[PDB]
Amino acid sequence: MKQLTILGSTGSIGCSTLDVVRHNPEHFRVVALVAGKNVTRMVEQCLEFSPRYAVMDDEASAKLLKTMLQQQGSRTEVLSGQQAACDMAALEDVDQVMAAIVGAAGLLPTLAAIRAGKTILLANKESLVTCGRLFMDAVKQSKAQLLPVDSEHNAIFQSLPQPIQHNLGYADLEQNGVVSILLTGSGGPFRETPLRDLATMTPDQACRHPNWSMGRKISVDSATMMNKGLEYIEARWLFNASASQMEVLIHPQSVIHSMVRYQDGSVLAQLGEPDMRTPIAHTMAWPNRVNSGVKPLDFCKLSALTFAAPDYDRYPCLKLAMEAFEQGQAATTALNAANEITVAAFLAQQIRFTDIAALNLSVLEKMDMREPQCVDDVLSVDANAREVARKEVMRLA
């Protein structure tokens, strides 16, 4: 009977984790729900699971949730602010923490759940893209169990050997028989578009396109593969890998979520439906399993499976993210940062598609950075990179 705390219990991955707790009530219990402003879905969930706690980002919002919970009689106690969240993450009697609150918002609560040595359902990129050095040391220190929920990492983890699974981060790949890790990705919708044509690409040609893909910003990240590359950054930290023990493969159909290469030639892989309840269920049930309400992969009703290597000319955002890792957590925190600006510039139509790569590039250049050292060094490197970025979209007016 595991007990959890969800950080971002109102977003996509939050509800999926709640749909997972719902169909498996015999093993899971909510002790705390943490959200941002959706007081609306939060009451519903507090009403359904009845966490001992509910936390919202501001008092304005809590004083209202506190109110609708009042209406229903929900004994659920309401708190507010960031501290409240970190306190739910470090909660004494809590077993796992679905670190699904994204952005910089989540760096501290994910960290507080880490510091407390808890099984961590790591459901946010930024935690390792910006605070990777810190976060992994915080794990060594307290022996917190990282369990990645991201489709790719979930698959790479499931495909790894056991003694590397219990020591996530300090488990040496190569000594335990791993030749390399196979990070796979669709390759974006402009994978076969002639190179001189990526410049004339519109936002409508890249935005939530089929077979495991549906999100405004990440479509441009799937399209530029700034997404894969950023998962290269987390992979490297998460699994303790060196650029030689890494591989990025274009797998258009996204059936194979990602693989792991071994010494004797065996390649271990994971596949299933794109549904996030699969990796949310795996991580929660581990080292056992539970149902999630997801479809058994019909290998018949399926597309043919192909692969390819990325063309670093067609996907510059990936070579950037690879070199960015080689420069330090300041270069990747600022690369993640400037990228959100630029992608955004592209979606509003301020710069060409091919300008996201070139500009994220520039900010990374025009900025002599120095490795961070806490959840604040990282915040700052982000606000300086955003600024070199917001200011860069500008010269193109």
Ligand X SMILES: O=CN(O)CCCP(=O)(O)O
Task: Based on the shown chain and the rule CB under 6 A, indicate whether residue 11 belongs to the binding site for ligand X.
Answer: no
Footprint (CB under 6 A) of ligand X, residues 318-377: none
User: Is residue 6 within 8 Å of residue 113, measured between CB atoms?
Assistant: no
Task: Based on the shown chain and the rule CB under 5 A, indicate whether residue 150 belongs to the binding site for Mn ion.
Answer: yes
User: Is residue 182 within 8 Å of residue 267, measured between CB atoms?
Assistant: yes
Residue 93, amino acid: D
- Confirm whether residue 231 is marked as ligand binding: yes
Footprint (CB under 6 A) of ligand X, residues 224-263: 227-228, 254
Dihedral sign for Cα 186, 190, 195, 201, please: negative
- Confirm whether residue 36 is marked as ligand binding: yes
Q: Which of 177, 189, 203, 328 binds a second copy (CB under 8 A)?
A: 177
Q: Nearest 10 degrees: CA dihedral of 199, 201, 202, 204?
A: -160
Task: Based on the shown chain and the rule CB under 8 A, indicate whether residue 278 belongs to the binding site for a second copy.
Answer: yes
213 binds, among a second copy, ligand X, Mn ion, none (CB under 5 to 8 A by kind): ligand X
Q: How far apart are CA 391 and CA 397, in angstroms?
A: 11
Task: Based on the shown chain and the rule CB under 8 A, indicate whether residue 285 belongs to the binding site for a second copy.
Answer: yes
358 binds, among ligand X, Mn ion, a second copy, none (CB under 5 to 8 A by kind): none
**Residue 112 backbone dihedrals phi, psi, to 5 degrees:** -70, -30
Tokens standing for 107?
A: 């760096």
302 binds, among Mn ion, ligand X, a second copy, none (CB under 5 to 8 A by kind): a second copy
- Confirm whether residue 215 is marked as ligand binding: yes
User: Is residue 139 within 8 Å of residue 131, measured between CB atoms?
Assistant: no
- Please identify, using beta-carbon distances, which residue of 170 and 307 lies nearer to a second copy: 307
Q: Which stretch binds a second copy (CB under 8 A): 10-18, 172-180, 360-368, 383-391?
A: 172-180
Q: How far apart are CA 188 and CA 295, in angstroms?
A: 25
Task: Based on the shown chain and the rule CB under 8 A, indicate whether residue 195 belongs to the binding site for a second copy.
Answer: no
Tokens standing for 42?
A: 């939060």
261 binds, among Mn ion, a second copy, ligand X, none (CB under 5 to 8 A by kind): a second copy
The SS3 assignment for 150 reads coil
Q: How far apart are CA 367 and CA 388, in angstroms?
A: 8
176 binds, among a second copy, Mn ion, ligand X, none (CB under 5 to 8 A by kind): a second copy
Task: Based on the shown chain and the rule CB under 8 A, indicate whether residue 309 belongs to the binding site for a second copy.
Answer: yes
- DSSP classification of residue 174: G
Residues after which the chain is broken (C–N above 2.5 A) are none
Count of beta carbons in the 10 Å neighbourhood of residue 192: 9
Q: Which of 151, 222, 270, 354 binds Mn ion (CB under 5 A)?
A: 151
Q: In the complex, which residues of this chain contact Mn ion (CB under 5 A)?
A: 150-152
Q: In the complex, which residues of this chain contact a second copy (CB under 8 A)?
A: 155, 158-159, 161-162, 176-177, 179, 182, 249, 251, 259, 261-273, 275, 277-279, 281-282, 285, 287-292, 294-297, 299-300, 302, 304-309
List binding-site positions for Mn(2+).
Answer: 150, 152, 231
